[PDB]
């Protein structure tokens, strides 16, 4: 149910970390100050991965085309994206980061 | 906008409509005859800027953008409907199902993980009195009716008639079409004489501003528009004179035709009656792009059987049509041709010189201005763009 | 102004010139001969940008905007002059005199409040010498002679020409007609051999820069021009080498001609004596747009009475007009044509590599951006703007 | 640059590749075949929007800007080579070396101060496997090889081509011809019947996007190119089904061909083997001008002999030039012309929905914006620009 | 009608703002305060149909609600394009606390 | 070989002088605050006279097309001039203005 990431301090705040599973798509663990999320990495807009794209705030912004979602809601937040990102349960527990195999019913 | 901001601060009165270049957006648009699409056969055509592809199966009508989600061609340049309810790009094969649009299938990678998640663009499509309308908007559409001006959609009311593209901003169309006063360019159609009808050359006004017209924004069906009721307190001009004395001379002749004029949102005018007492026109300037519209010209004759419709298709073909639609309306089509150059810059919003009769046109863009559901922009073209 | 700021701030020496893209306002200019325009019958021109119109009545000229003040479309598109003193808008016929353009009366509504408090922009009109000139300025012209190289107006001067539209600035055709190094283009017209004239190929010039012109400024009748004087110091090039090498050269006629030349404002030049001894070419280079004008030619030769000026005529139209306004010029069209995409953009003007015999188009430019009369903008064919 | 900066920002993994809508500068390109120049006789032809003249003499070709240094015309409208060596503009006679390009000699002024202190824009230019190269950069050119395919000038590989002018950007060509998915449009072209070929309707991607593609960073000459490796481990789909349904099936033929399909700055695809098993395929996509570019065609195959270049030679003539470049081919020529109104306002390179097998075409994108040798721009056309 | 009509008391006008007289079987004057002091023209705007009570005060610079052209409304002058021809001017002037305007308009300056 | 070119007084900061040559091109002296420069006068990109140009610091602009070189190395400091302007040495010995024979 549970995939280890990596310890909480491993990531400075504003950074993004991509993560390979095996058999599934890649998935994405934003850290918003001292909160972690997680997403798909591949953007809903084309085949982008969105680990290498630029973090502000709570808005993770597209390398290809510079549409960009909230990492919280994976809701669309700039254009030309419009289907929304699959979110991922994260939790931190012992000073470390999980994220969940499915994402969020 | 679609419009030089410092021009849409001097028009105050009527910005929007200065703006709507492209036309509105959410209102339903009449682009051809249901006769003209025939089952499983695709029909492109241009709206409000946008390339659409309609088709009709089982008899009934959809509407899918002309557009590619993937690299952006028409698909319509190399039609591959595979299945009855799909197309299939000629490109790399992705494939969408007419009646919701949705990515189904991508024959190029059958395990594409846009598969199911992305949606190509598709329009409401309604056939009335033998018409295809298409709602050039977004959400569930509103009744047809409020689109389309009183009495339209009479069951009784027998449509016929006739669609062509010309060379024209939409909105000169419109104008040309409720202008009182242009009157004059009908002085000498074939309709007059071989019909004997009453025309004067224009109107001398009488009453105050608000008499010349009767706004409508209190239609229960939702209806917008604009009475011209120059006729009911001005003079009919029938002796034209220049220096006092006479050079020209309205028709003197029996039959009474167009004194119930009105102009409806999105672009629609009914003229009453006419091209003969037991008539009414309607007829919609439909934008294409800026440069273009459709002249969707309608005549409508109750018909109370089918022996009637038959001897009003008949008349229709050998009198209505080319005496009138086209003998009489002819010279509108070259009229809104003549002002595109004053216009086309946009300044023309600015430097027109108006008089008493063009009250109505002023009316008529305020109304527009006020209850429009949508400007239509370049970017709905495109691709809306925004970093909200 | 009409060009980009940047490049105008480039060429300092002459910015009001550069930026004349349309051409100078408030200047006398010939757009067809006399006989080309006949009692009561309008025609239509574009003159700096303007849509005119000029008409005959009772002999004399008289030019209206050909654009109707209401929605500003072309009278023209279908002229209705009902009287002998106005013409009718065909659209909502205002009516104007040709005399002074006053709104004088509107056929659609007598009782406006329009009529006579609205006036169409009218422009003077003048013929002579078989030619007619439009004033197109503001205000009260000055006399025509101001416009008009010398000699042009001279009593026994028999005036004959051609003219034609050509695809180019009216800045190219005026440098290219006074470029005495373009000499070289005519090197084998058939009028260099058919009448036996001497045509060097170039100028080795001398003396310094002041001598290679004569800046006129202080004429009595106001006329501003410049004098080609690269032949007084210079040594004719009839020999053209390359390392050395004879591999051209220039005609050995007995003929002299073309040693008298000179460029005027608001554009045209004269050229003495030419294309014979006893002869002189006078031609204007008319702007219509920013990318056409009117190649104005005219051929003067004295003549005494009627009977020389018969005899002229025919010599005109079997030879002079054949072997030099075409044979001689022609290839000064093309040569025009082929300036134009290096100034399209604006950027030749910053571009362009100039050599010693430039001078003298050095001089016109600089003359051209002190005494110009005004520039013509684009706001001047809108509508001049100002805000309080 | 040449794109809207607010486009720029947003493609940050190819901003270059987009701005480079002319094209790269400093790379090396066939615009012709050896056969169509002759000694003597200059031709013409534009490059990167830049117009150049191409002449050869003494069996060597030289290359010029066919643009005079004087007033900036066509030296092209009137050639007049004087001297087996030079070229002398028909305005003033302004001569230049085709050795060099420098002014070497000014017939109308044979003292002007300009002779020998100015010079003509020279490129470079190559002849190659009978195909005619031209360096369109600046300095030193780099080898020919690095900007060609590998064994494209392998001493026994024959060359034989075609080429013409294609009206899209060379960008759209150039994904076009490198797509992997694009081969659906390929399915009933009469050289995979006529040939047996053996060709599915695309891939189902397999391994990971890593492996899709082998960008080649350097190279012995330098080259920088990229592998389309799709098919290592994916998996070829011949039949095409919509809901389950097989409505389209792939070609079963017995040749197996462009296992080894890649693509080379500055934009020359190689596919091997093709179109037969003993042959190869390299093409260009030449930027002409923003909207149009060469379609250099090219097939190759080892011979020994003049026995078997004579065979090779005939059996390109009467079947792999009318069966593959033609036959196969042209449907890649209207499928470039179908993308440019996407891409024709820079906001297809936004709106585009990329899928799966695109990864070739992002490879290729990135390559290009890290390894091009500039990017041309509008001002490489007209002049440099740059203020102090 | 007659040479001076009454129109309001001037203390019904704030500074600034501007009064549409209506008059029987003649078209409607406009009367502008600006401060203390009152002008008047006709209210019509000479670009076309527009009423300039309708439109913006700016000092003594009134704006058509229009198309933006504007008149200066002392000396009833262009003040801004399209505008080109002159307002009618008509003498107001207050007796009593009483605003009267002229029932015909002044004559050509200069 | 040096000509005397005129006394430093002779120009006031900021101007340039043109010093013809009987049989050579023309020169242009330019003054830069105290210092004292000098190229050929005739602009390389046309037949513009530097000398009737506009001097900014040690960089002259052409008045014909906005070309613009940098008085002290010649070398163009604005487009569309290409080709290096000629620079002479040049030298003021009690108050006096020489300028080299030959560019240098
Ligand atoms: S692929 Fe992410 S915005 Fe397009
Ligand atoms: S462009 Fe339609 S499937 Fe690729
Ligand atoms: S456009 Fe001329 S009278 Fe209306
Ligand atoms: S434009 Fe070529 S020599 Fe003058
Ligand atoms: S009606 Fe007043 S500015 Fe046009
Ligand atoms: S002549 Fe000096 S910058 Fe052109
Ligand atoms: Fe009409
Ligand atoms: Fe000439
Ligand atoms: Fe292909």
């Given at each position: 149910?549970?995939?280890?990431?990596?310890?909480?301090?491993?990531?400075?705040?504003?950074?993004?970390?991509?993560?390979?599973?095996?058999?599934?798509?890649?998935?994405?663990?934003?850290?918003?100050?001292?909160?972690?999320?997680?997403?798909?990495?591949?953007?809903?807009?084309?085949?982008?991965?969105?680990?290498?794209?630029?973090?502000?705030?709570?808005?993770?912004?597209?390398?290809?085309?510079?549409?960009?979602?909230?990492?919280?809601?994976?809701?669309?937040?700039?254009?030309?994206?419009?289907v929304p990102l699959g979110v991922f349960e994260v939790?931190?527990?012992?000073?470390?980061?999980?994220?969940?195999?499915?994402?969020?019913? | 906008?679609?419009?030089?901001?410092?021009?849409?601060?001097?028009?105050?009165?009527?910005?929007?409509?200065?703006?709507?270049?492209?036309?509105?957006?959410?209102?339903?648009?009449?682009?051809?005859?249901?006769?003209?699409?025939?089952?499983?056969?695709?029909?492109?055509?241009?709206?409000?800027?946008?390339?659409?592809?309609?088709?009709?199966?089982?008899?009934?009508?959809?509407?899918?953008?002309?557009?590619?989600?993937?690299?952006?061609?028409?698909?319509?340049?190399?039609?591959?409907?595979?299945?009855?309810?799909?197309?299939?790009?000629?490109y790399h094969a992705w494939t969408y199902r007419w009646?919701?649009?949705?990515?189904?299938?991508?024959?190029?990678?059958?395990?594409?993980?846009?598969?199911?998640?992305?949606?190509?663009?598709?329009?409401?499509?309604?056939?009335?009195?033998?018409?295809?309308?298409?709602?050039?908007?977004?959400?569930?559409?509103?009744?047809?009716?409020?689109?389309?001006?009183?009495?339209?959609?009479?069951?009784?009311?027998?449509?016929?008639?006739?669609?062509?593209?010309?060379?024209?901003?939409?909105?000169?169309?419109?104008?040309?079409?409720?202008?009182?006063?242009?009157?004059?360019?009908?002085?000498?159609?074939?309709?007059?004489?071989?019909?004997?009808?009453?025309?004067?050359?224009?109107?001398?006004?009488?009453?105050?501003?608000?008499?010349?017209?009767?706004?409508?924004?209190?239609?229960?069906?939702?209806?917008?528009?604009?009475?011209?009721?120059?006729?009911?307190?001005?003079?009919?001009?029938?002796?034209?004179?220049?220096?006092?004395?006479?050079?020209?001379?309205?028709?003197?002749?029996?039959?009474?035709?167009?004194?119930?004029?009105?102009?409806?949102?999105?672009?629609?005018?009914?003229?009453?009656?006419?091209?003969?007492?037991?008539?009414?026109?309607?007829?919609?300037?439909?934008?294409?792009?800026?440069?273009?519209?459709?002249?969707?010209?309608?005549?409508?004759?109750?018909?109370?059987?089918?022996?009637?419709?038959?001897?009003?298709?008949?008349?229709?073909?050998?009198?209505?049509?080319?005496?009138?639609?086209?003998?009489?309306?002819?010279?509108?089509?070259?009229?809104?041709?003549?002002?595109?150059?004053?216009?086309?810059?946009?300044?023309?919003?600015?430097?027109?010189?108006?008089?008493?009769?063009?009250?109505?046109?002023?009316?008529?863009?305020?109304?527009?201005?006020?209850?429009?559901?949508?400007?239509?922009?370049?970017?709905?073209?495109?691709?809306?763009?925004?970093?909200?």
């Amino acid at each position: 149910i549970w995939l280890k990431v990596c310890a909480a301090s491993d990531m400075q705040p504003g950074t993004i970390r991509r993560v390979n599973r095996v058999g599934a798509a890649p998935l994405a663990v934003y850290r918003v100050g001292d909160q972690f999320y997680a997403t798909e990495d591949t953007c809903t807009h084309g085949i982008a991965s969105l680990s290498e794209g630029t973090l502000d705030g709570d808005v993770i912004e597209c390398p290809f085309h510079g549409g960009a979602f909230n990492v919280c809601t994976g809701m669309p937040a700039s254009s030309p994206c419009t289907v929304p990102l699959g979110v991922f349960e994260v939790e931190v527990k012992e000073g470390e980061v999980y994220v969940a195999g499915e994402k969020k019913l | 906008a679609n419009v030089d901001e410092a021009i849409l601060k001097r028009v105050k009165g009527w910005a929007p409509y200065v703006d709507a270049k492209l036309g509105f957006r959410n209102h339903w648009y009449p682009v051809m005859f249901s006769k003209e699409i025939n089952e499983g056969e695709p029909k492109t055509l241009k709206l409000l800027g946008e390339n659409l592809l309609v088709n009709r199966i089982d008899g009934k009508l959809y509407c899918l953008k002309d557009r590619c989600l993937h690299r952006g061609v028409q698909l319509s340049v190399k039609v591959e409907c595979k299945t009855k309810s799909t197309i299939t790009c000629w490109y790399h094969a992705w494939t969408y199902r007419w009646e919701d649009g949705v990515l189904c299938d991508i024959l190029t990678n059958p395990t594409s993980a846009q598969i199911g998640r992305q949606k190509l663009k598709t329009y409401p499509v309604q056939e009335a009195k033998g018409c295809v309308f298409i709602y050039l908007g977004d959400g569930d559409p509103p009744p047809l009716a409020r689109d389309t001006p009183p009495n339209f959609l009479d069951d009784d009311m027998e449509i016929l008639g006739k669609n062509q593209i010309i060379k024209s901003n939409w909105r000169l169309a419109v104008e040309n079409g409720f202008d009182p006063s242009h009157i004059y360019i009908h002085k000498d159609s074939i309709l007059v004489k071989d019909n004997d009808l009453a025309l004067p050359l224009g109107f001398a006004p009488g009453g105050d501003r608000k008499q010349q017209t009767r706004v409508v924004d209190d239609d229960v069906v939702g209806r917008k528009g604009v009475y011209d009721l120059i006729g009911e307190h001005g003079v009919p001009v029938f002796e034209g004179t220049i220096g006092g004395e006479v050079v020209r001379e309205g028709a003197y002749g029996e039959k009474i035709v167009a004194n119930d004029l009105s102009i409806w949102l999105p672009g629609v005018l009914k003229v009453n009656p006419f091209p003969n007492p037991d008539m009414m026109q309607f007829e919609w300037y439909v934008p294409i792009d800026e440069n273009t519209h459709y002249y969707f010209q309608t005549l409508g004759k109750p018909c109370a059987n089918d022996e009637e419709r038959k001897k009003y298709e008949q008349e229709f073909e050998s009198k209505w049509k080319p005496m009138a639609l086209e003998g009489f309306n002819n010279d509108d089509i070259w009229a809104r041709e003549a002002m595109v150059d004053f216009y086309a810059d946009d300044k023309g919003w600015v430097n027109e010189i108006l008089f008493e009769s063009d009250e109505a046109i002023v009316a008529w863009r305020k109304l527009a201005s006020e209850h429009n559901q949508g400007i239509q922009t370049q970017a709905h073209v495109s691709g809306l763009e925004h970093h909200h």
